[PDB]
């Protein structure tokens, strides 16, 4: 008895099982649709430090997957390469059908070592991990996924009104992270600017900030040196908060731009 | 409304598999067709905030039932939920012994 | 025909979706594979249970033949096919009102 939403006159009335309302008309199975809506649209924190907290590892529960016919572009998607600290596999390899989430503005690729208590990784929020029209309850290794929930819809009159046209470019950038103690409270992440330069990661940092940081490091960060890989603590030294608003929020406009000079860098050690 | 939920995204940018009717070229053929990445299509439903927002709420609500249904089922891969909803709809409206002028049966004279 | 029919049926079934209200629906915060099942005992009616056992024994013939025909490794559509067939027979086409082939009750 999953709730089946009925769209009438561009208004969403969830259906009533017992009522068998005469009005609603299901002409064909085309009208039936499953929609996978991302969590990022729900106002949840979407940065990898906070997002990892919602994911969790448990064992003794079999993984399940569902198909969602249509999905929403996700600003942030995550690809995990977690391995156990001895190098053992932590996340199950993707089954043949499973493929990466189709449309992602920012792919957060986390490769690192973490305690891996459970056989599989599950979403503590109850949501599904969306993979290319397949919604799973378990994280699969090395496949881009966007955490989301699946909604089932009865589309209106199949008159091309909904999901057939835009009533009214795909460029995906990979933000590569490295993590230790993945899946525990004591987790630390390093944003990987390049092979030799890493930046300590905090929740405040947004993907736009991280890309700007990458540019700033490249232009004037003296990233290349013989000392070794450099881990930099970074703080935007601007009075306003960094990326409080969500991606949709205020169309991300009139947003203060943190010129390269504002960012402050110190070497952790 | 969706203020129970902390933030509702006003814009819905949806990616979906292409419609069967639109494609006419010799790209249906798998060999000559688009790769997995290219099959998708795009849309934006920004104009109507109320429907899409309600929709996010509906998805948050339905996830509980979906999870329980998955727990009960033994399906490794479940693709029959929509069909089961369809058969439920038909079985419900037209299960049988439906009065010609009754609440149970949709049929209406003339 | 059956030699001995167990009069009482102790059945293990998956939990009702309506029954669960706690945050155990969440897979991570939830019962393991063993916990999902819900118990029951249909001891009240012996005749029904013995009919059910006879029915199962008779149906296995068709079930095995149907499995042979199908190429499914795992066949989960038998119930859906029964529902579709039930609807298709009741309402396949051109129901006759007065006629009992399609039983729609005039007032």
């Amino acid at each position, epitope marked *: *008895s999953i*709730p*089946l*939403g009925v769209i009438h006159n561009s208004t*969403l009335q*969830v*259906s*009533d099982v017992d009522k068998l309302v005469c009005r609603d008309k299901l002409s064909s199975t085309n009208q039936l649709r499953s929609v996978g809506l991302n969590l990022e649209g729900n106002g949840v924190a979407t940065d990898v430090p906070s997002a990892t907290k919602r994911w969790g590892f448990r064992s003794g529960v079999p993984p399940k997957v569902v198909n969602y016919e249509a999905g929403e572009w996700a600003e942030n998607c995550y690809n995990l390469e977690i391995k156990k600290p001895d190098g053992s596999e932590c996340l199950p390899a993707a089954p043949d059908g499973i493929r990466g989430f189709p449309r992602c503005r920012y792919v957060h690729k986390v490769s690192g070592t973490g305690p891996c208590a459970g056989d599989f990784a599950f979403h503590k929020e109850g949501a599904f991990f969306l993979y290319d029209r397949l919604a799973s309850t378990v994280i699969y290794r090395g496949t881009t996924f966007a955490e989301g929930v699946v909604a089932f819809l009865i589309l209106p009159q199949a008159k091309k009104d909904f999901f057939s046209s835009h009533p009214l470019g795909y460029y995906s950038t990979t933000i590569r992270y490295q993590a230790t103690g993945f899946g525990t409270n004591e987790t630390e992440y390093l944003f990987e600017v390049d092979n030799l330069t890493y930046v300590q990661l905090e929740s405040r940092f947004t993907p736009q900030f991280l890309l700007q940081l990458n540019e700033t490091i490249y232009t004037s960060g003296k990233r290349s040196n013989t000392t070794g890989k450099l881990i930099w603590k970074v703080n935007p030294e601007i009075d306003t908060t960094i990326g409080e608003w969500a991606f949709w929020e205020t169309k991300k406009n009139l947003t203060r731009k943190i010129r390269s000079e504002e960012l402050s860098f110190t070497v952790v050690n | *409304i*969706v*203020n*129970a*939920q902390p933030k509702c995204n006003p814009n819905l940018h949806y990616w979906t598999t292409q419609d069967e009717g639109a494609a006419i070229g010799l790209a249906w053929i798998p060999y000559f067709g688009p790769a997995a990445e290219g099959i998708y299509t795009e849309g934006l439903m920004h104009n109507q905030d109320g429907l899409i927002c*309600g929709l996010r*709420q*509906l998805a948050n*609500e*339905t996830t*509980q*039932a979906l999870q329980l249904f998955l727990r009960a089922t033994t399906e490794l891969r479940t693709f029959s939920i929509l069909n089961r909803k369809a058969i439920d709809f038909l079985l419900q409206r037209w299960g049988g012994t439906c009065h010609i002028l009754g609440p149970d049966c949709c049929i209406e004279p003339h | 025909a059956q030699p001995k029919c167990n009069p009482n049926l102790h059945y293990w079934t998956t939990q009702d979706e*309506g*029954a*669960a*209200i*706690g*945050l*155990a629906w969440i897979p991570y*915060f939830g019962p393991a594979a063993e916990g999902i099942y819900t118990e029951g005992l249909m001891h009240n009616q012996d005749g029904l249970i013995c009919g059910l056992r006879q029915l199962a024994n008779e149906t296995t013939q068709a079930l095995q033949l149907f499995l042979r025909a199908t190429t499914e490794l795992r066949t989960f559509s038998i119930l859906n096919r029964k529902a579709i067939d039930f609807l298709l027979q009741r309402w396949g086409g051109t129901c006759h009102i007065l006629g009992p082939d399609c039983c729609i009750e005039p007032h």
Partner: antibody
Amino acid sequence: VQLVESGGGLVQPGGSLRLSCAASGFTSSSYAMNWVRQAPGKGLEWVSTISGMGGSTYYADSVKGRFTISRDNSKNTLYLQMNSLRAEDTAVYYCAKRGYPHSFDIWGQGTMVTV
Amino acid sequence: DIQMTQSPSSLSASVGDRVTITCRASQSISSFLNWYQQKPGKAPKLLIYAASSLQSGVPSRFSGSGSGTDFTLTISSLQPEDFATYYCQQSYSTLTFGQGTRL
């Protein structure tokens, strides 16, 4: 910020009663409101809950087939249609809103139903 | 199903004292216990979000303690308004309440 309950009264064993819980200061449509029944001197038990949009209706074991609960989101009102009332149902009923562990957070003033 | 038991059915203490009220679950619930304070004759008020988290606007003196199977609530200073009865609710399955505890 306020939940108001109404419809309580005297009903003979059997029969039906409708309990109306109305939301003031909240858009009830958004939140999943719940009904909790406190028997006099015998503690609290949860009787039913609804999803925000009304798609999911959830009932306790005792009233699984007896109570029908529905929400009119337009009016920010919740209706609990008690039916086939039994002797034990003679208790005050509270309507509350869901929380982090399916936790009733804002409690409207209880109404009394007597059989 | 799981059965909720508050160990102290009733206890009496003076103002300014340390008191712990314990609610025990027959089977472990993953920190899904929330506490309710019911003033006598008034609708219950939520206290602890889930085992430890303290509801906004509830006095900080109330402290939520949580564990896998056994949960406790401690009142720091026993002000007179806090002398009212308390309840424990589980959220693992069926949302049962423990038998109320009387101060």
